[PDB]
Structure 1
Amino acid sequence: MLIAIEGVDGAGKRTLVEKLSGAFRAAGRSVATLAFPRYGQSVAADIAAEALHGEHGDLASSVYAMATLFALDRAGAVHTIQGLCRGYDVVILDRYVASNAAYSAARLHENAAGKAAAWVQRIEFARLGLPKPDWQVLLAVSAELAGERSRGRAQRDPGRARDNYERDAELQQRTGAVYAELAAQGWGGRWLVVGADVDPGRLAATLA
């Protein structure tokens, strides 16, 4: 089974991935996790991050350029993903294709039924062959709280300064809204919307 954890920056995704992995293992299931962007393993991913931190000229100013880099990263992970699926009972992805749809639409002030989301659907799932997730878990949190967590991380970790997307409060707000729409329409597969207080044990039961 393939599960993707989605949400805005600072929503608490990384933590849910760890608590969820623990719950699945407590249930006797083998688990593997993979996070996107794959920093260090994908040139496209590294350039994307660097662009969001001020490098590479006008690259970051293009919504489709950034989306393409993230899609190229995932395109290079197809074999890895399929490999994990046949090797473990559960594979949890920290961000996946929906991240591209949500942020791209938000940067363009479009909704889930818009152009960017449709483009991501055509390119990543159909064209690049990325498998559709069995479940997509949206960790919905207030934009304010998520932003506070992003700011806090940067304050105590010099290696985690915020990037262009994280510093854009309005973008973060719009991204959360598109995410909610995507989940409501079951974009790319079945979704589950949870809060910060979700119980990892019951969540793993629903997913398993």
Structure 2
Amino acid sequence: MLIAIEGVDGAGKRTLVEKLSGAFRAAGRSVATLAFPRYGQSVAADIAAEALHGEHGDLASSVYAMATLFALDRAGAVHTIQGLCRGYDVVILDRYVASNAAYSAARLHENAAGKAAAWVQRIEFARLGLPKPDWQVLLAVSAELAGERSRGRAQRDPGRARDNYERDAELQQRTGAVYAELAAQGWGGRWLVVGADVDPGRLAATLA
């Protein structure tokens, strides 16, 4: 089974991916994880973030370029994903294709039914042939509270800092909104909108 955890920055995905990765393990089913972007493994992923940190000329100023880099990263991750799906019983992804739709759409003040989202559908699932997730958990958390975790995170870590997207609050809010629309319409597969107080034990029982 292929599960993808989605949500704005500082929402708690990394951790949910941890508490859920353990909930399934307490069930005999082997679990595997992979987080996107694949920093260090994908040059495109690295170039994308460094750009989000102010590098590589006018790169980040192009919504579609930034989207392409995150697609090209995953593209190089197709055999790997499939392998994981074959080997392990469960595979959890910290961010997946839905992220490109949510952020790209939000950057263009478009809604889930917009062109950017449709564009991500066409390039990633259809064209790059990236497997669609059996499940997409939208860890929904207010844009204000989520921003607080992003700010605290940058403050608690010396070699760290929010990027162009995390500094843009209105972007975070619109992405939250689009994430909500995508889940309602079950974009790329079925969605489950949980919360911070979601019980991993059950959530994992739901993911069958």
Aligned structure 1 segments of 4 or more residues deviating by more than 6 angstroms: none
What do residues 128-158 of structure 1 show as CA deviations (whole Å, max 9, x unaligned)? 0000000000000000000000000000102
Q: Secondary structure at the match of 1:93?
A: strand
Distance 1:156 1:173 in 2: 23
- Could you tell me how far 1:170 is from its partner in structure 2? 0.1
Q: Secondary structure at the match of 2:57?
A: coil
- Could you tell me how far 1:159 is from its partner in structure 2? 2.3
What count of residue pairs does the alignment treat as equivalent? Answer: 208
Runs of at least 5 residues in structure 2 that lack an aligned partner in the other structure: none
Distance 1:111 1:148 in 2: 25
**RMSD of aligned alpha carbons:** 0.4
What do residues 34-71 of structure 1 show as CA deviations (whole Å, max 9, x unaligned)? 00000000000000000000000000000000000000
Distance 2:164 2:23 in 1: 34
Runs of at least 5 residues in structure 1 that lack an aligned partner in the other structure: none
Distance 1:90 1:149 in 2: 28
- Could you tell me how far 1:13 is from its partner in structure 2? 0.1
**TM-score, normalised relative to structure 1:** 0.99
- Could you tell me how far 1:7 is from its partner in structure 2? 0.1
Q: Secondary structure at the match of 1:178?
A: helix
Distance 1:168 1:21 in 2: 30
Query: How much identity, in percent, do the aligned residues show?
Result: 100
- Could you tell me how far 1:123 is from its partner in structure 2? 0.2
